[PDB]
Structure formats: C-alpha cells, structure tokens
Amino acid sequence: TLSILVAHDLQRVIGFENQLPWHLPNDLKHLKKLSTGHTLVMGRKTFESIGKPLPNRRNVVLTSDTSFNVEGVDVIHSIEDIYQLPGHVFIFGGQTLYEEMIDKVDDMYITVIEGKFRGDTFFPPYTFEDWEVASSVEGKLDEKNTIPHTFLHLIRK
Ligand SMILES: NC(=O)c1ccc[n+]([C@@H]2O[C@H](COP(=O)([O-])OP(=O)(O)OC[C@H]3O[C@@H](n4cnc5c(N)ncnc54)[C@H](OP(=O)(O)O)[C@@H]3O)[C@@H](O)[C@H]2O)c1
What we know:
Strand order of the largest sheet: 5-4-3-6-1-7-10-9
Oligomer: monomer
Strand content: 25-35%
Shape: globular
CATH architecture: 3-Layer(aba) Sandwich
Bound molecules: NADP nicotinamide-adenine-dinucleotide phosphate
Order of helices and strands: EEHEHEEEHEEEE
CATH topology: Dihydrofolate Reductase, subunit A
Helix content: 10-25%
C-alpha cells in the first residue's frame, strides 16, 4: 500500500525554509501513530531538516547522491525504487516527492492546517472529484495545540 502523508495549510503550504511553518505537537503524534512499524520515504532536503531517522519505522531517503550513507537510513536513487519497498509505504515529503507521487499513491493522509502561513513549498493542487473522504476528524485544541486542524483520509476513486 502506497500512501501520502502530509500536513498542508488552507493554501496548501507545506514548508518554509526547509522546516514546518507551524508548531503543532498533536499532528506529529498523529503522523507517528500512522507510520510506526511501517516505511517513510522522504526526499533528501526533508531528511536533512529532520537530521536523524525517526525511531520504530523504516526510514528511506530518495537522493541522487551516491555518497549518501546514513546510519539507520536506507537510500534509494529513483522513484522506481519506491515500488520495490514492501509493506505499507508512506510518501513523506517534501514538495518534490509529493509532486512525483500524487498521481501514483493509493490514498492520502492529510492534516489540513486551518490557517494561512508563509511558505516556500507547496502540496500540489488536487480535487475532491478524484478523492473520496474515507474519514474527516477535527483535531482537538489546547494550550500547546492552538491551530485548528482536520485529519483527512482520502482514497482515490
Ligand atoms: N508539511 C508537511 O507534512 C511536510 C512533510 C515533509 C516535508 N515538508 C517540507 O517540504 C520542504 C522540502 O521540500 P523540497 O521539495 O524542497 O525537498 P525534498 O522533496 O524534501 O527533497 C528534494 C530532494 O530529494 C531528492 N529527490 C527528489 N526526487 C528525486 C528523484 N526522482 N531522483 C533522485 N533524487 C530525488 C533530491 O535530492 P538530491 O538533491 O540530493 O539529489 C532532491 O533535491 C521542507 O520545507 C519541509 O519542511 C513538509
């Protein structure tokens, strides 16, 4: 199973200066819940910004750099390599990977961040006429989680 994993704002901003534009602990908990025990594929810039593999899942980095060899990370050098990855595979950014994979994934787990942030990277436009809402759940807010957000699971029609 091949799934997109992403948080984007009302204008589909996903990043600014190689980091998330928002601070939202609950969404990171959500994404770790979805992906534990599975596989995260990420482009090189996204990986470098995280800086270290996420524990308790297979971390795969897509890069053209043949000198890339990081402890606890598997490297791939083509999109085609993604299809050889066994199990539930999550496409986890950044913009380049989303653009390359959005026409290929089975479904998408999207957190809509219900705000407008300054961004330099975007999730590609998509339409609900291609995607059925399997679920839509409003995130609960508190002191440390102050931006309204909605967890979507969309499945390709
Ligand atoms: N909001 C979210 O849920 C979320 C999640 C993840 C990331 N992000 C954001 O996304 C932004 C980064 O996106 P980005 O597009 O700048 O970078 P990126 O997708 O993270 O990485 C781009 C790099 O990935 C490698 N790559 C991509 N396609 C390739 C291919 N077909 N063959 C070989 N290598 C390939 C290349 O690495 P090389 O140059 O080394 O060859 C390319 O330069 C950051 O701001 C980050 O915060 C947001």
